[model samples]
Target: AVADLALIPDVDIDSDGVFKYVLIRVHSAPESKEIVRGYKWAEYHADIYDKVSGDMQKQGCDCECLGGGRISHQSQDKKIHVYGYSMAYGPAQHAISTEKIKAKYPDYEVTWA
Candidate 1:
């Protein structure tokens, strides 16, 4: 069922001390585009990021990885930073990864808890 996945950016529209949030699909299975578009959150607006950041608006960069890439933003006073990303691999396997990440030094008893 994990045909395609997406990671959306979070923004605070009101600037009332809380940040707004939205999840959007930036990529998907070639055949699933139309289906993905049918998702309720698919039609998110682009202006909100700028609208909420007020005077701290800056250029959004590109994402070359999965999905369609990523978007990042900073607050007007440069206190907060937000980033969003695309889809995923799969479900059952999604929660797990075959690739392993270990500490550089084996001498220390390093492990993730």
Candidate 2:
């Protein structure tokens, strides 16, 4: 149910050795008109290999969370979706965020490992 905070981890883990696309579900709260208010995002940065320079380069992108607070959609299945980009590190950190959410909504499901 939307009120249960049923979280599921969806990913695009191809053989590229990188996580290009990742999504985490935070089911809408029963009483909240807008679910985005409950979200909190940490700062992010990354590095990538550049063939022309033959070196690893620092890059910046929306590595996880709320799509700068614009990405969202309705669902016929009683849940909403939140999508983002991240590396192994950011997703690892996401566990902590979800833990906090679980604490606040102790009865909700936060089983997206």
Candidate 3:
């Protein structure tokens, strides 16, 4: 099934307001490897969280931030809304995670890769 992309007018909605977490499938060409190669991460996942600091230090990426942050809030009804992105397409051939998309429609984009 195909899904529609809507810009929720309000960010104050809760997770329950989301209806469901959508999963997408994508195909990457030879050009896509460049996206991964240029990942140019501000910092590895290890460098970003305080709880992960000790283990990350062992791995050698020390006290830096990931240049990203997230915010979450709850509604009086106890619903939750957080900020994040759900990638719809990102897998190689023979990669069946796409089947996992029995969950939701996936958006595939080369430039977005």
Clashes of each: 3, 0, 6
lDDT (0 to 1) per candidate: 0.22, 0.27, 0.23
Candidate 2 residues 1-113, lDDT tens each? 23322322222122211122222223233321111221212222122111201210111111223221111222233222333434532433334434543454444444333
The deviation in Å at residue 88 for candidate 1 is: 18
Error of 3 at 96 (Å): 24
lDDT accuracy of residue 51 in candidate 3 = 36
lDDT of 1 by residue, 1-38 (tens): 23322232211122212222222222333321110111
Clashing pairs in 1: 5-87, 11-20, 12-20
Model 2 alpha-carbon drift over 4 Å, by segment? 1-84, 87-92
Model 3 lDDT per residue over 1-113, tens place: 22121311101112222221211111122101100100112233222233333433343323322122222222234423223332222222211222322112223211111
Question: What lDDT does candidate 1 reach at residue 105?
Answer: 21
Better of 1 and 2 by TM-score: 2
Query: For candidate 3, what is the lDDT?
Result: 0.23
**Candidate order by decreasing TM-score:** 2, 3, 1
The candidate that wins on TM-score is 2
Cα lDDT for residue 70, candidate 2 = 16
Given candidate 2, what's the lDDT at residue 15? 20
